[PDB]
Design a binder for this molecule. Structure first.
Ligand code: SF4
Ligand code: SF4
Ligand code: F3S
Ligand SMILES: [Mg+2]
Lengths: 534, 267
């Protein structure tokens, strides 16, 4: 009984923003895919003519999931344009807020965005909580008892019997689903940790506000450094440290073990949603003007040739519009970018998305945790190598298993673990620096009348870049090229499928009415359509 | 998704960055889990709901058409240019979705400056013709309670909802339809640096010893004096707010602030 025909998923939920996924299915497997982004705001148009200092305030509102990242990218971009070298402490504080962002973001993604593709919450009601506690205590140094899990089950039971299932209404697992494999106990463990993560993420986000004023949308960055003199104090540092420590413990004791248990039960998912090419910009600089000073280094890989990592040349990026709702067909380097909307409706003139299609030396590039992890591994990054190897050894799989939806999901966990530890290193360096008597957090600068600048951030979804042309001291052009633009943008003028589109080819679909397999792959990229389109 | 028991909430996303959604996840005493399991029935929310596609559309239908009634919480501006083309969900323009759904709500809350006043995508030259909910749907008699900020304090959303459930009415609203219980004071009159303001003690730059010392940020652009919000009182994430982090207020709870308050580092 295998389906042949179209499937449309609109809206794709449990992502940021407005995504329409279209596939052609033949004999129960995807043979073709379109990634259609269906909201445009036009932030690049809006920025024209404004004060370059104002850009980060506008561009932070690209996205509130990956909050801060755009403020950081814009500030790095205008810092660069202006030629200011910010103080060491501004780099530490900016880096620490970014590390905290990664932890918050990836924990919410795994539990609150991804996990309902794999966890049947309502079967948790069937579980034996004593059995479940045994399983939970075996996978984590954290002891969980039967009473602990019964409390969760009792709460869920009361919720489900009220007949108001809320966010679980019409879930693809309701009633059972052949593509959902977990036993009741494991469903209960995952559900308990979903609930727990709702409160832990409050602390993970609070860590950003300690130095960064507030979450969402931090307000501590300025051209030349940061503003938060209070971040130098022992008390604020202690507060940050305490939140970081609790967040890292959750990563280490709850998220990664759950990630491994789910991956082990869905090991068939090593066979779907692979991609060919990877790009990453590096993150957590010692030197704001040298990407190779970053804890994770930039790199480019084509056709999985990790033995030949290519250097990242920022002049080889062009953004295509041939299959996008913009004027014409000409790809542009972002320093010569154009944002000229022209809507033709779905597949009108072969156009189907508000996202541009970024290509690197003409190739579609996956960016994000899998790119950052695999390129770092391949550069000999010792922390990445040790976590990655441990994960691979725990799952009983080889390296090729990483080129898949499961692999990508695993890489998101690996990066979270590695960054959670690295935050402690940065924190200590920061403390050390203060202890040497360096209490400087902002440097003076002057606005040039004419300049070009670029800022690079490796955000939780990958390589982010903001590009400015200053003219008469104002914004002459401002272009964002965002990780989800790379990953989820449409085809280019060479008709090459984007990473998400290509990864969907081969996806089995058990039940076309409930196409959870498509969600699993799409969600593994952690799409952000406000980011991708801006 | 609903029925009796808990009050049904339909949460819509228009032209938005999802920062407002994330702000609600930061809910503190009550936390978001209490709100979703005990207080409210969250019957549609694209960010966290299990269903997608046709199944999500069916969930939304079932919620909106329930004889028990629903509350609408709306995030994002409505793009109205080119007959609403710039924003679609399930291949329906956002304008069309909100025009159909919001008049059916028992109460509508516009959550965040984009939903209340148009927000970032409404900033000049406003290519998508983005409008706040009450502006866009004026003709259909929609009058949403406006909870402004970018994003708002989630304290203010929960407080407004709790009031509504208790009193079966909107709380006192200001002339921008914002609750006076949260938006009745300027940020500035509540600010700890007000004594420096009064004394004309202004930081001349962010690197200055005056900035280190906590002097007033007015000369560096602070919009506290023209901005109505509860930030210094409630704070964010139970721990900080922009001026205590050393940065000026950018006026983010005010209409058209992207154009009115800019350049952000000038007064
Ligand atoms: S009000 Fe601000 S935070 Fe909320 S959706 Fe709009 S841009 Fe995002
Ligand atoms: S820092 Fe801003 S809100 Fe505070 S006293 Fe000065 S102008 Fe007012
Ligand atoms: S920028 Fe917004 S968050 Fe409060 S301090 Fe000013 S109203
Ligand atoms: Mg762009």
């Amino acid at each position: 009984s295998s389906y042949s025909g179209p499937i449309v998923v609109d809206p794709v939920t449990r992502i940021e923003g407005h995504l329409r996924i279209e596939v052609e299915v033949e004999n129960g497997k995807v043979k073709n895919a379109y990634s259609s982004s269906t909201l445009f705001r036009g932030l690049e148009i809006i920025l024209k003519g404004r004060d370059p200092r104002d850009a980060q305030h506008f561009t932070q509102r690209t996205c509130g999931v990956c909050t801060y990242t755009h403020a950081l990218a814009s500030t790095r971009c205008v810092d660069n344009a202006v030629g200011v070298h910010i103080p060491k402490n501004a780099t530490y504080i900016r880096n620490l807020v970014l590390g905290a962002q990664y932890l918050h973001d990836h924990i919410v993604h795994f539990y609150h965005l991804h996990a309902l593709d794999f966890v049947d919450v309502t079967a948790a009601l069937k579980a034996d909580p004593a059995k479940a506690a045994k399983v939970a205590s075996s996978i984590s140094p954290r002891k969980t008892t039967a009473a602990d899990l019964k409390a969760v089950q009792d709460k869920l039971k009361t919720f489900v019997e009220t007949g108001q299932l809320g966010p679980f209404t019409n879930a693809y697992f309701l009633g059972g689903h052949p593509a959902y494999y977990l036993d009741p106990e494991t469903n209960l463990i995952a559900t308990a940790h979903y609930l727990e993560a709702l409160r832990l993420q409050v602390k993970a986000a609070r860590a950003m506000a300690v130095f960064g004023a507030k979450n969402p949308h931090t307000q501590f960055t300025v051209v030349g450094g940061v503003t938060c003199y209070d971040a130098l104090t022992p008390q604020r540092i202690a507060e940050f440290e305490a939140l970081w420590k609790e967040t890292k413990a959750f990563v280490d004791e709850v998220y990664i073990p759950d990630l491994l248990v789910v991956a082990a039960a869905y090991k068939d998912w090593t066979q779907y949603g692979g991609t060919d090419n990877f790009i990453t910009f590096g993150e957590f600089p010692k030197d704001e003007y040298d990407l190779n000073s970053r804890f994770f280094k930039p790199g480019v890989v084509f056709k999985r040739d990790f033995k030949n990592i290519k250097p990242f040349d920022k002049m080889q990026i062009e953004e295509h519009v041939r299959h996008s709702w913009y004027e014409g067909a000409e790809a542009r380097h972002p320093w010569k970018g154009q944002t000229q909307p022209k809507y033709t409706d779905l597949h009108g003139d072969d156009r189907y998305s508000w996202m541009k299609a970024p290509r690197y030396m003409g190739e579609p590039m996956e960016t994000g945790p899998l790119a950052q992890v695999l390129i770092a591994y391949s550069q000999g990054h010792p922390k990445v190598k040790a976590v990655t190897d441990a994960v691979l050894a725990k799952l009983g799989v080889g390296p090729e298993a990483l080129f898949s939806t499961l692999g990508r999901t695993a890489a998101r966990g690996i990066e979270t673990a590695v960054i959670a530890e690295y935050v402690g290193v940065m924190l200590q360096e920061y403390k050390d620096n203060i202890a040497k008597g360096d209490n400087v957090i902002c440097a003076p600068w002057e606005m040039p009348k004419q300049a070009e600048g670029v800022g690079f951030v490796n955000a939780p979804r990958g390589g982010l870049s903001h590009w400015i042309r200053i003219e008469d001291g104002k914004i002459g052009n401002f272009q964002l090229v965002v990780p989800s633009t790379w990953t989820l943008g449409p085809r280019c003028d060479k008709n090459k499928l984007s990473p998400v589109e290509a990864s969907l080819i081969g996806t089995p679909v058990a039940d076309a009415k409930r196409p959870v397999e498509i969600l699993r792959t799409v969600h593994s990229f952690d799409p952000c359509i406000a980011c991708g389109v801006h | 998704l609903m029925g009796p028991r808990r009050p049904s909430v339909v949460y819509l996303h228009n032209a938005e960055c999802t920062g407002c959604s994330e702000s609600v996840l930061r809910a503190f005493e009550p936390y978001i889990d209490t709100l979703i399991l005990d207080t409210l029935s969250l019957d549609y929310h694209e960010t966290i709901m299990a269903a997608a596609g046709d199944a999500a559309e069916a969930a939304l239908e079932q919620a909106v058409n329930s004889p028990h009634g629903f509350i609408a919480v709306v995030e994002g501006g409505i793009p109205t240019a080119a007959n609403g083309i710039y924003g679609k969900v399930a291949n329906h323009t956002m304008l069309d979705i909100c025009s159909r759904i919001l008049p059916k709500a028992q109460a509508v809350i516009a959550y965040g400056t984009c939903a209340t006043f148009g927000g970032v995508q409404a900033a000049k030259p406003n290519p998508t013709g983005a409008k706040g909910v009450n502006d866009a749907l004026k003709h259909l008699g929609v009058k949403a309670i406006n909870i402004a900020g970018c994003p708002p304090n989630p304290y203010n959303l929960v407080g407004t909802i709790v009031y509504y459930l208790k009193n079966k009415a909107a709380p006192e609203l200001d002339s921008l339809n914002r609750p006076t219980m949260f938006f009745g004071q300027t940020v500035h009159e509540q600010c700890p640096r007000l004594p420096h303001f009064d004394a004309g003690e202004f930081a001349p730059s962010f690197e200055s010893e005056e900035a280190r010392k906590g002097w007033c940020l007015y000369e560096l652009g602070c919009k506290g004096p023209v901005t109505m919000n509860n930030c210094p009182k409630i704070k964010f994430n139970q721990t900080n707010w922009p001026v205590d982090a050393g940065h000026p207020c950018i006026g983010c709870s005010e209409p058209d602030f992207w154009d009115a308050m800019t350049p952000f580092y000038q007064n």
